[PDB]
Design a protein around this ligand. Structure first.
Ligand SMILES: Nc1ncnc2c1ncn2[C@@H]1O[C@H](COP(=O)(O)OP(=O)(O)O)[C@@H](O)[C@H]1O
Ligand SMILES: Cc1cn([C@H]2C[C@H](O)[C@@H](COP(=O)(O)OP(=O)(O)O)O2)c(=O)[nH]c1=O
Ligand SMILES: Cc1cn([C@H]2C[C@H](O)[C@@H](COP(=O)(O)O)O2)c(=O)[nH]c1=O
Ligand SMILES: [Cl-]
Ligand SMILES: [Cl-]
Ligand SMILES: [Cl-]
Ligand SMILES: [Cl-]
Ligand SMILES: [Mg+2]
Ligand SMILES: [Mg+2]
Ligand SMILES: [Mg+2]
Ligand SMILES: [Mg+2]
Ligand SMILES: [Mg+2]
Ligand SMILES: [Mg+2]
Ligand SMILES: [Mg+2]
Ligand SMILES: [Mg+2]
Lengths: 187, 190
């Protein structure tokens, strides 16, 4: 049982907001829900360490992946075995967009690292809240362009898992679109 | 330029003792030496991270690897580039023996993670201080059964790369181990 969903986008694309509203929507239908996030959900100390320190991309990816590995094991997989709808604000796609397309690390290596860290757990549906970095409500601009395009490139590679939402629209109608796509996967 | 050396073995095998003796022995010969270690040489804060309760073996290895990636880029390669003899107390082999043979993680995955973590950098010589498992004395569930697997793992890694590894008997007195290490170095120096 259980359903695994993720949200992705740049910081200030409104992921937490939509994660909050999606939880509330599923609670209103009586469906058990669990919110969680990366970084921090597996190893909170990773999150606080990366906050005040910049490393090499390789080193920083491996920390994200250790956190992810604990996150998948202690939080996400248990939640799904209990029949809950688990919603993660950021997951693997964040590393692929930021460390891969942004900092330039090779994608095939990242996914081979990720495969054991995640046990190959992929979300059923990932919502990409897309906007230009200048429109975001919260290493130059060029880095943030690369991450956004990277997200869009990931989405067009897997059109079955990504749902690309224009994040500049009002939050209420963005919420209804997410609800629309999600409807078929519940009764 | 430069020479990359490492010390390996179980907890309590004399690695730290012998790396420090070696460093000092090379400095007295007038050679530039960089003494380093793992975990912590790349990312000091990883030792905090590694103590986390009930840490899965995958996260464990990825933590060691985060540190290793930073350690290679910021400390080891720039030291080697300047012609220093760089000695690391523990390197990739620790992960292969502890997280591979000890925890049961697949070696090919470990090595695939290692490729980009180390950028292919392997030491010229690695001194394995082979210690009996019962003599070994932080990390989760460091039991006797674990140490047998780790010890035998080290010995299998030695057999697979017998030109890189020099296996020495860790129960021998410290002067004799150091002299034996020094003798395996002599052709690689002047
Ligand atoms: N050849 C030896 N014989 C007996 N004891 C030793 C020998 N070498 C080191 N020791 C002692 O064993 C302990 C562990 O040594 P250490 O160098 O810290 O091991 P490691 O670095 O491998 O953990 C220390 O108290 C040290 O004095
Ligand atoms: C470098 C490394 C260490 N370890 C383990 C060995 C030790 O039990 C622990 C710390 O090593 P070390 O710092 O050498 O021992 P000490 O803490 O006594 O100074 O980490 C691994 O499991 N994998 C690794 O890749
Ligand atoms: C989960 C994850 C986050 N990040 C970064 C991108 C964001 O700027 C930042 C978000 O942290 P925050 O949500 O605590 O603000 O973390 C990555 O670079 N890779 C990842 O895999
Ligand atoms: Cl699912
Ligand atoms: Cl957000
Ligand atoms: Cl995924
Ligand atoms: Cl060899
Ligand atoms: Mg993470
Ligand atoms: Mg990962
Ligand atoms: Mg894709
Ligand atoms: Mg030591
Ligand atoms: Mg080594
Ligand atoms: Mg490694
Ligand atoms: Mg053997
Ligand atoms: Mg070997």
């Amino acid at each position: 049982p259980g359903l695994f969903l993720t949200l992705e986008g740049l910081d200030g694309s409104g992921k937490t907001t939509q994660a909050r509203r999606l939880a509330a929507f599923l609670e209103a239908q009586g469906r058990p829900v669990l919110l969680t996030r990366e970084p921090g959900g597996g190893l909170p100390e990773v999150r606080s360490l990366l906050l005040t320190q910049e490393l090499s991309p390789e080193a920083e990816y491996l920390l994200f992946s250790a956190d992810r590995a604990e996150h998948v094991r202690k939080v996400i997989l248990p939640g799904l075995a209990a029949g809950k709808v688990v919603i993660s604000d950021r997951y693997l796609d964040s590393s692929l967009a930021y460390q891969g397309y942004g900092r330039g690390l090779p994608l095939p290596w990242l996914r081979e690292v990720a495969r054991e860290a995640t046990r190959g757990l992929k979300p059923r549906l990932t919502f990409l809240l897309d906007l230009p970095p200048e429109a975001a409500l919260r290493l130059g601009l060029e880095f943030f362009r690369r991450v956004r395009e990277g997200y869009l490139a990931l989405a067009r590679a897997e059109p079955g898992r990504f749902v690309v939402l224009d994040a500049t629209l009002p939050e209420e109608e963005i919420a209804r679109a997410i609800q629309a796509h999600l409807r078929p996967l519940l009764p």
